[model samples]
Target chain A: MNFLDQLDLIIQNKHMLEHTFYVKWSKGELTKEQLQAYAKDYYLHIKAFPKYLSAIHSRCDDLEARKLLLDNLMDEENGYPNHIDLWKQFVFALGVTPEELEAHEPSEAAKAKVATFMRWCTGDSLAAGVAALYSYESQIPRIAREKIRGLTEYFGFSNPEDYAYFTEHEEADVRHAREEKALIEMLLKDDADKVLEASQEVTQSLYGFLDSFL
Target chain B: MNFLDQLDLIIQNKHMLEHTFYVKWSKGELTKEQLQAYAKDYYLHIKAFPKYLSAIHSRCDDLEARKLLLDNLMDEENGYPNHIDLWKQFVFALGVTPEELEAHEPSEAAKAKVATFMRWCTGDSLAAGVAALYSYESQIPRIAREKIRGLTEYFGFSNPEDYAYFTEHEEADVRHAREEKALIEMLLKDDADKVLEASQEVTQSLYGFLDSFLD
Candidate 1:
């Protein structure tokens, strides 16, 4: 197929991956203890985000594209006022100290998956790297809404502060996901093979995240 | 020193480097035989120009800084019909194909210096990186004027088209360099160490460009 067609197909299939991941993550089957375990693992993956962005920025030829990558990277690094200090919040909610979280070892599966994602992003083209981010972030709002609802309604988590990370994702991921999709469309409009390759890589990375936990 | 002082230092020193490099190159101290060699070496350095600006755009939190960097980078890359295309004319005059110019290999010294500059830019603070770039670009007008005079008077290259790169810079660089100086001064006023480091590094980089050839 041509590039654009390949991109469309890839994007279409990626949505399915997001939907499936969200469904599983939001099943509310896990206890608070289990949820904490998952959050801890997830944080490790995100910690590598800035480096991944810098790598992509280094390679991108288009000014706008590079700027977008860098801006997002910086936001991920230092954007919010730590209004909730979500990273710390997540571990603290689990009764873990900042030191414990920092020094804690990841499960083998988590390590492998996160490492693979980091490598793909840092080593791949700007389009592929960004597509990988969209794969994960696009799934967040849906998954997060479910988590927020389940924690508030089923789990009885008091105050939105305890669930702020999930709640924030519900609002923020929508914007992030949309911007990412727009960038992908603009960058890979004619190059289906590249789009497909990038999409497949991103999809695999997302699935790998879930597989690490399961 | 204050940020403005640092910026002024960059403006003055960088101009001197450019002035010296072109003076030597124009005096037949450097030869037409060196054109392809120099172009080949310089091409890789500038090949990253678009990416560098894009990085600056990404890192700059300020809207004004982002806009300025974007405009400058675009001008360097492919902005006004008269700007980047003008450089192409000079490359052609040197009998180098655009593709060859784009993909040319550099001398080891040139390659190392260029790589070092890109690394500093990508790895440094955004403000510092911007200051470093301003140092080099700010010198273009004076340097270009000198080179243009050399071409017309000494080298006797009659057609302006053959010297379009220098001609465009002769007019455009003064305005651009001044704007860059003002911006750097404004942004860096509070940070003395950063200003000094940026000034020193940028000047060193510009001087290194000259060292790559003379030896």
Candidate 2:
């Protein structure tokens, strides 16, 4: 099978949308405080997103690969106010301040998730880094759409600005994941199994990152 | 001494602008082939720069420090066409194509320079990362100004777009190094000595990167 097809098999086992926290979110079963807490904890990863791309960009020896990665980094950092600021905007309606988001200590699961991602992205194999990126981004479009749906249909958050973070991701990560998958294909030409292992590790960590919110 | 001053002391010993390659360039003594070689080799560092910042950015434990680094990264990556493209513009005047620039193999000195920078920036101490940034950026405004002068007065390249890379850094690194110095102070607090060690190491590697261009 192709690298992405094999990756799909691995991700199917622990797809983030199927995680209880997101499922709860989709059903409006999560409390406001839970969402608030989720907002704070999740912001850690959101803030570090571009940094992850940079680590891989730096480690990449190929100009073609670096250019692809730099384009993604620029997209994250060059938004109207940038993606991190957009996330702060998303949380403001939940009564979370940018200060609180930055200052809050991460829960154990949150720390584990960030550390897991950092390890893979900073690891020796560029293929693993590509796989890690593919794992996270490939899931984002569906997760973002679900998040927007939950906020509007179930939670009565009608103002689009309150959830612009999800809206942005819903569109952006489709391209991001597509680019990452292409990179993975190029880097892991015959190692579909290797991509699976890396993808599974990152996908499982993300599932754990959400476990704390519920 | 304060952190910036201590860092400055380390830097003055091997300031990039005073390096022989730049000195020859400013005197209009280097050949077009020599300038072309410098462009191709130096692009290795210029391109890896944001990656260095990002490596430190990922490793930083302080929100304030990350914000400072992020601002620097954004400034590098968010130019009208971004700083990498700007460097390509500067080199095109020397007859270097973006494709050739990307494909050129680095000299041993150039490789050592990038590896040295990646080492400190990716090292354990965020203070070292901040110092490494300060070491390089602190010298840029002056180096850029001299380069601009050489390109115009001596070399007869008058198109502003041709040297936009230096012009951009002439203005940009002042703020970049300033922000990095503040972070170094905050991180190092009392280790004026610590910043010096990191600063000296990076400054020396850069001097060597320039060494090969003259040979």
Candidate 3:
């Protein structure tokens, strides 16, 4: 298959993971206790993001490409607020404070899920790092769009602040996903080994994260 | 001391470094043999900037502060096309091609200087990282202004593109230096040890890059 086609396959598969993961959460298929547990465990994964980007930056040789990657990485690092802060908003929506969330350590299942994802990204190649990011971006827009849309309508969120966490990503991740896909396609175009490894690592890490909720 | 006073001290120290370094280079004080050496070493220092910022982002806990630093880092990464590209513009003004610049490498002295700066920034604290960046930003306005005025008035270069690198930074670094100063002050305000250590590291690394220029 051509490069674009191969890229589409990875994106499509990642989207499928998102569909499954969100279906469970959005339908309230997971208990509130379970959702809280997932959030607590997910903190480590969010924290590891900058380090993952740093590893990719270290490995890249092309100057312009490195600059572009670094720019995006900085945005992720400094990006408007952060995912954790967004998590804080969500927890607040569920009637929790920053302090409470900080105090609540991740369960063993959450810790295992997070540690596995970190190990893959940190230990794997640059392609693998890109793939891991792609999974998160691929999943984010769909999950956020659906969550935000339903939030005001079915979930009856009156104040926008109540759903700020969901609303923010609904916008931000569209741009982020595009950038990730473009970077992945640009870097891995001719290299089959990188493509295969990246896709596999991305899929596995995502599955590892999802297992916590399941 | 007040915040602004502290900031002034930072800027003044940076200004002193730049003035001394550039004076040594601009006069025929440096031998012709040294130009390429300086360029190559400086290139390596310029190249590693993005990675250093990424390291800072990885360590930071505050989301808002991280976002602020990230924005500044991206600006630096994307800001001025490369200096080599600017040099290419000069070459083209004299009717040369990109291939020529690509083939040319700088002196060993330059390479060592640049490598040392990169290592120091990459290995050190984020505050020190910002200080290193501030050193560059702090120099640009004055250097750019002087270069533009010199080229236009004395060098007889009419086209603005001939000095685009200098011209771009004249305005760009004004904002960059301000933001960097604000960030460094904010970062170091609570941590006295970090403030002093970062300041010392920044001064030493900067001086190291300059001292390499001396015969």
Best by DockQ: 3
Which scores greater on TM-score, model 1 or model 3?
A: 3
Model 2 agreement with the true structure over B1-215: per-residue lDDT tens digits: 36577678788878987888887887789888888898888887877787788778767656667667768877786546678878888878889776887678888888899899888887777788789888889899999998899989888887898899898899999999889878886677565665677888899888888888777
Query: Which residue ranges in model 3 land beyond 4 Å of their true spot?
Result: A1-23, A40-51, A70-87, A106-124, A145-175, A188-202, B1-21, B24-41, B79-96, B149-154, B178-215
Interface RMSD computed for candidate 1 is what?
A: 7.4
Interface RMSD to the true structure, each candidate = 7.4, 3.1, 2.9
lDDT agreement with native, every candidate: 0.62, 0.80, 0.60
Residues B1-215 of candidate 1: C-alpha lDDT, one tens digit per residue: 35666577656755653445566766756666565576567655555665655555544445455446645654565434434456667777778887877676567767666565566466546666666666667776776777777767766688888988887777766766676665565555355566557667767766766666664
Enumerate residue pairs that collide in model 3.
Answer: A78-B67, B36-B107, B37-B107, B37-B110, B41-B110, B41-B111
What DockQ class does candidate 1 belong to?
A: incorrect
* Candidate with the larger lDDT of 1 and 2: 2
> DockQ numbers for every candidate?
0.12, 0.34, 0.40
Fnat of candidate 1 is 0.20
**Alpha carbon deviation, residue A46, candidate 1 (Å):** 20
Question: Residue B190 error for model 1, in Å?
Answer: 5.5
Q: lDDT tens digits, residues B19-114, model 3? A: 555675444354434444444455555555555565555555555656666665666565466544564465555444456545656556555544
Worst 10 contiguous positions by lDDT, candidate 2 chain B: B186-195
